Scaffold this active site. Structure first.
Site, PDB file in Angstrom:
ATOM      1  N   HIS B  64      45.590  36.871  38.317  1.00  0.00           N
ATOM      2  CA  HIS B  64      45.918  35.879  39.330  1.00  0.00           C
ATOM      3  C   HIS B  64      45.465  34.464  38.970  1.00  0.00           C
ATOM      4  CE1 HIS B  64      41.948  37.052  41.217  1.00  0.00           C
ATOM      5  NE2 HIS B  64      41.900  35.768  41.571  1.00  0.00           N
ATOM      6  N   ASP B 206      43.458  43.417  36.935  1.00  0.00           N
ATOM      7  CA  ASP B 206      43.504  41.982  37.108  1.00  0.00           C
ATOM      8  C   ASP B 206      42.854  41.215  35.963  1.00  0.00           C
ATOM      9  OD1 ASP B 206      43.785  39.479  38.425  1.00  0.00           O
ATOM     10  OD2 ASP B 206      43.479  40.416  40.366  1.00  0.00           O
ATOM     11  N   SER B 632      36.528  34.422  40.853  1.00  0.00           N
ATOM     12  CA  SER B 632      37.624  35.148  40.210  1.00  0.00           C
ATOM     13  C   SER B 632      37.554  34.953  38.684  1.00  0.00           C
ATOM     14  CB  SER B 632      38.957  34.588  40.686  1.00  0.00           C
ATOM     15  OG  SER B 632      39.269  34.987  42.008  1.00  0.00           O
TER      16      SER B 632
END
Ligand SMILES: COc1cccc(CN2CCC(C(N)=O)CC2)c1
Ligand SMILES: COc1cccc(CN2CCC(C(N)=O)CC2)c1
Ligand SMILES: [Cl-]
Ligand SMILES: [Cl-]
Ligand SMILES: [Cl-]
EC number: 3.4.14.-
Lengths: 695, 697
Positions: B64, B206, B632
């Site tokens: 992402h 991810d 993240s």
């Protein structure tokens, strides 16, 4: 793993003892004496119950005693939503059409039935499974004046293992069973439809009744002179509770299983039965949901119809999950191949011939069964105006004497029942358009019910126009349209009514298909007799039980949770804390009873809380149960009552075909929670006093 | 509670970390005067974290995080977003425009310097102590005049911490030639997609791979064909030992924001105004959008991204309100401030009690204003699309009232109208949403406080919201394409001045700005009081068991690999496996489609050295580390500082962790590095990436 016959207790006792069983074999089941089996009852024909006191007190589920609680509820005393707690035996409410059946004796009559069967002559006669033929055999063996010479008693012979074993049951039936206590619907149906088939679960699914009898304890219909039954055996209530891995056992009446399905029958159940039910109910429920969310009045009217549709829909989803992930088809295929290989070694081809017969019959009835399921799910239960009034042959031969007004009153009563306070023609038209569009896509013109041919022939494929025309021109399309017919009724008008023609032709096809399909059941049943006979001759009557047939069975396992999916574990026990976590005051399903909330806040758990101080609500076990086991007593290693079975998790619905050790769990309400609700919610101390409670 | 610690605090935390499992030397993890593992951490693209994992500048971050970069290089012919991307040579790695990677070269405590410069106090109520402009002027003064030119690649920045009680200067080295190297297909990179967002268990791979490029000397340089891979100061070693339950884990990264020092009154306000209004208003908006999307598949295509975007802060507000209700956040903040007030009374210093009172009185005073601001922002500004319809500018209005510049104004208005009424805009859906949002808005906002045009609902339309909204579209130049073109052909300023949609958009934005300007003054007394409040908390409990609020600066956190019980009778373990991906597979649901190469790897048990002892393939794990947005792509480390995974999310039960860390619920959701290596090896077949990493058995 199994739903064992009482006859098989001897053969299973050693394994049960090793798994934790401490009580003597004959104290659990005695074929010629008194045992714990004598405290188990078939409650109201489709539930299980249990005697828990020397004055005939009976515990079963809340959903089992639901209709009885609903019948005694009014606007003034709504026992369904607030509960019911008779403070004296005189206050206990009698119930019309209720029964409790004790299994007094069970006897193996296989040789007797097999010998009587030799006088048939027709080899493909279905008398071996006929309740009428089997009742004539039961009456012959019991005696001519058996029920007169033995008041309260009756006999019955049932087939087992596809006609390879027969048992005679001596039943004692009591019909004066009175409502004694019931928690409010907020406790008895806490999860309501959301938690249905779900574990973890926090539902206090119980209701209390009492068996009444004559002065001598013999069965008697309701009379003000009836006195509580002093039973020969009742369950002791254990307050010791449960711990993970503890031995648990259940006695009850599992209704049906299909353990001996062929792989072809599993394919058929998936691809026809389940796939059609899932597809059709999804279309119906989708339209109902759109309409319920848009109009709060439609949500009131259709909530029960929506929830009812969702019940078998959820079960079909769960069953298809097992077929896909648990390898049910493959295990049945392995079972039949193993038998065929053994039969070839033995030089007996009848077992292979029997599997082939089932396979060929399933293959032959495929298009017919598909059409039956398509019309049943799609129109019969999918469209409300399919169940609209159809004038009887007597009603039409009265409209064309002044008994014309009697016919119109009979038709008006049926029309009022169809177009009731919960019926919306606009919602029904929308559901019908979506259901019919799917139906017409799957059923070709030549196989359509006669009136549905008009969609192509008269309406140029416009389903919406066809449905619009039914309501616009029909005498059942609106109240005004009915009253206009009622004022000037002509048989000609009824004979050409679009809704009547629809309802008639859809029911014609529905019955025509049923009658065409019925003959196919017999070759399968006859072949299953040979198939099961082979399986029993090969692997023995030790590690395989007969299919459930609403007869008394025992099952055992351990109190244990399971992993439903990767990295998730569901424990063996739920607590009152879990009820409080789920509380939603604006959702009728998860509203928490104020007295129960107060008990939780005050930690007023008395002797019912566990060692850690937490209040238990429910537990789950590796016992093998199915529908009919609702209200079944759950027992300790010593045969003391530890809870009531009330459900099975959705991951275990496939357990009716193959028991799933790592997924299937019986959902049981902890007896400690049952006593807590009686004590702190109902304040009915007299019920606790009459029970024999062990510390 | 469990922190997002400054690198400065590693020394005083080292003993606890060692007791909790840490085995590496303190200065090997962070050293103010030398190379440490800190030098392998980067701020990836301004709002994500990354890490250098090779001696040729290889960088790992989330899928992402690198998503926009993968989407920019994707076409119909080569859809790298759908099928993944694996450059088989360094020359094949794709450059990215407007990308950056920031190394934190040095961190220095400049508190006394800033505090001394602040004493040149013209006004004691000046907010310069928190001003990025003032702090940049101080940073430039201390580093030197023309520092950027004298030191190519480097830049300096001063940030406030602890409400203005601590200041740090950061020397940042920025690289802008960062090329895409590898990426799994979207089916792996975003396996859960929106269903599993904020969810644990999680089965998402991810990750995305990039590479830092620089000039021949390793100095930052914008994209040039002559650029060569960076040889970094330090890089992470990849551990194949995996994780076990209770294992020590630590993370370094850039947590964006927290509100650890909120008063109990601020928690009440966040619940009762911010969250309750956002939840109520978004529920009405999302409800109408859902009804329309299900009814028309074309509306589902058009509104899917708008619906999902609305659901994001809606889910967060639900999760935040769950924590306020069940975890006792308000009570714990109240206990914190009462404890300080009691200590201040014992010390004979009332300024701390006076500071909490100041915050409480300001929060109480701005309540009706803040309620109206949130009501109009959620209800109309965000809630109704035609609120963002074209408003003719001052110059555009003046242009239409004697030159060819009239056609220029109509072209400028037409461009804004095309952006508003685009391929995803439906006037009919917007009218339905507006009727439901306005009905709720008019119920909560009295006539006297309404934006001027909304008074017409009562005055001109007899309360008929539907008639008022119908009238806006029927008479407005922006109601349809035909209505706009008819205006465009004969445009008069009079028509625009009395346009119902223009009057609505102007009126709602005028009230939105009026409320914002009335509320702005209230922020300053709270910030000034928070400086005293946090100063008291630090003077009392110390800078040992309480960390400063996240402010997009480099922090370290530690905990253990462990699951949690989300509800009664349910436990979620510490690790998910490839089996869990297969269980979730749904070929007819774009979120849960499983990549065919991955499904075959699973079927063939082709797990190489990446499987655990039991032979199961790990996918993700969770830890008791304290992370928030900005974390993240953060590297997850072993007791020895070896890479064990990449942080990519936090469970919804831990969103309240931005106010108070929730030990029994909050977990960082990390993708196991063994699964990352499995996808590179058996899905991408990009052996060269495995070869350049230093992998420990
Ligand atoms: C929480 O997620 C999972 C998923 C699957 C397996 C486990 C480990 N088990 C937990 C308890 C069990 C028992 N029988 O008590 C034995 C080990 C945890
Ligand atoms: C699903 O059943 C539950 C729910 C909540 C708590 C527990 C207790 N166990 C959790 C897991 C733990 C471990 N494995 O570290 C041991 C204690 C079980
Ligand atoms: Cl009896
Ligand atoms: Cl002071
Ligand atoms: Cl917590």
């Amino acid at each position: 793993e199994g739903m064992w016959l009482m006859q098989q207790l001897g053969r299973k006792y050693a394994q049960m003892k090793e798994r934790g069983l401490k009580m003597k074999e004959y104290d659990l089941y005695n074929p010629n004496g008194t045992s714990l089996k004598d405290a188990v009852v078939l409650f109201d024909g489709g539930c299980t119950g249990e005697v828990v006191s020397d004055r005939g007190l009976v515990l079963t589920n809340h959903h089992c005693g639901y209709d009885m609680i609903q019948a005694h509820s009014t606007l003034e005393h709504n026992y369904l939503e607030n509960g019911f707690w008779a403070m004296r035996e005189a206050d206990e409410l009698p119930n019309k059409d209720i029964s409790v059946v004790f299994i007094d004796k069970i006897e193996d009559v296989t040789d007797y039935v097999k010998k009587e069967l030799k006088a048939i002559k027709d080899p493909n006669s279905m008398d071996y499974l006929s309740p009428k033929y089997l009742q004539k055999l039961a009456d012959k063996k019991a005696g001519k004046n058996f029920s007169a010479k033995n008041p309260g008693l009756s006999v019955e012979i049932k087939a087992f293992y596809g006609g390879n074993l027969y048992l005679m049951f001596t039943k004692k039936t009591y019909t004066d069973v009175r409502l004694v206590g019931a928690p409010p619907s907020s406790i008895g149906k806490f999860g309501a439809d959301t938690d249905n088939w779900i574990w973890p679960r926090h539902t206090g699914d119980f209701s209390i009744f009492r068996i009444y009898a004559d002065k001598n304890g013999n069965p008697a219909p309701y009379s003000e002179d009836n006195v509580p039954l002093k039973p020969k055996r009742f369950f002791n209530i254990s307050l010791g509770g449960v711990q993970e891995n503890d031995y648990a056992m259940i006695m009850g009446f599992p209704g049906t299983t299909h353990r001996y399905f062929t792989a072809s029958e599993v394919d058929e159940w998936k691809s026809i039965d389940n796939d059609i039910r899932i597809r059709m109910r999804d279309i119906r429920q989708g339209v109902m949901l759109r309409e319920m969310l848009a109009d709060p009045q439609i949500k009131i009217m259709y909530s029960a119809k929506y929830a009812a549709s969702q019940n078998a829909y959820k079960r079909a989803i769960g069953a298809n999950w097992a077929i896909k992930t648990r390898g049910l088809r493959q295990n049945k295929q392995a079972m039949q191949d193993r038998l065929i290989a053994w039969g070839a070694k033995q030089g007996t081809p009848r077992y292979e011939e029997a599997v082939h017969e089932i396979d060929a019959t399933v293959a032959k009835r495929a298009d017919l069964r598909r059409r039956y399921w398509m019309i049943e799910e799609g129109i019969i239960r999918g469209i409300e105006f399919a169940r609209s009034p159809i004038p009887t042959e007597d009603e039409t031969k009265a409209l064309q004497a002044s008994a014309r007004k009697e016919a119109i009153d009979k038709i008006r009563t049926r029309y009022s029942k169809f177009a009731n306070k919960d019926y919306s023609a606009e919602v029904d038209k929308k559901v019908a358009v979506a259901m019919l569009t799917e139906y017409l896509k799957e059923i070709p013109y030549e196989n359509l019910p006669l009136h549905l041919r008009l969609v192509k022939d008269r309406f140029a494929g416009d389903v919406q126009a066809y449905v619009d025309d039914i309501f616009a021109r029909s005498v059942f399309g609106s109240e005004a349209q009915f009253d206009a017919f009622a004022a000037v009724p002509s048989v000609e008008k009824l004979a050409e009514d679009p809704m009547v023609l629809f309802a008639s032709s859809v029911f014609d096809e529905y019955r025509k298909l049923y009658n065409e399909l019925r003959p196919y059941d017999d070759p399968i049943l006859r072949a299953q007799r040979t198939y099961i006979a082979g399986l029993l001759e090969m692997d023995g009557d030790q590690d395989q039980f007969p299919d459930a047939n609403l007869t008394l069975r025992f099952t055992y396992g351990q109190v244990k949770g399971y992993s439903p999916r990767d990295n998730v574990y569901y424990g063996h026990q739920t607590t009152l804390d879990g009820v409080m976590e789920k509380e939603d005051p604006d959702n009728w399903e998860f509203v928490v009873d104020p007295k129960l909330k107060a008990v939780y806040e005050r930690k007023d758990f008395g002797r019912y809380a566990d060692r850690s101080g937490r209040m238990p609500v429910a537990f789950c076990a590796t016992t093998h149960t199915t529908g009919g086991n609702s209200g079944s007593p759950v027992m300790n290693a010593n045969g003391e009552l530890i809870g009531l079975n009330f459900d099975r998790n959705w991951e275990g619905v496939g357990g009716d075909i193959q028991y799933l050790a790592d997924y299937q769990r019986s959902i049981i309400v902890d007896i400690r929670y049952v006593l807590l609700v009686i004590d702190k919610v109902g304040g009915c101390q007299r019920l606790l006093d009459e029970m024999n409670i062990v510390p």
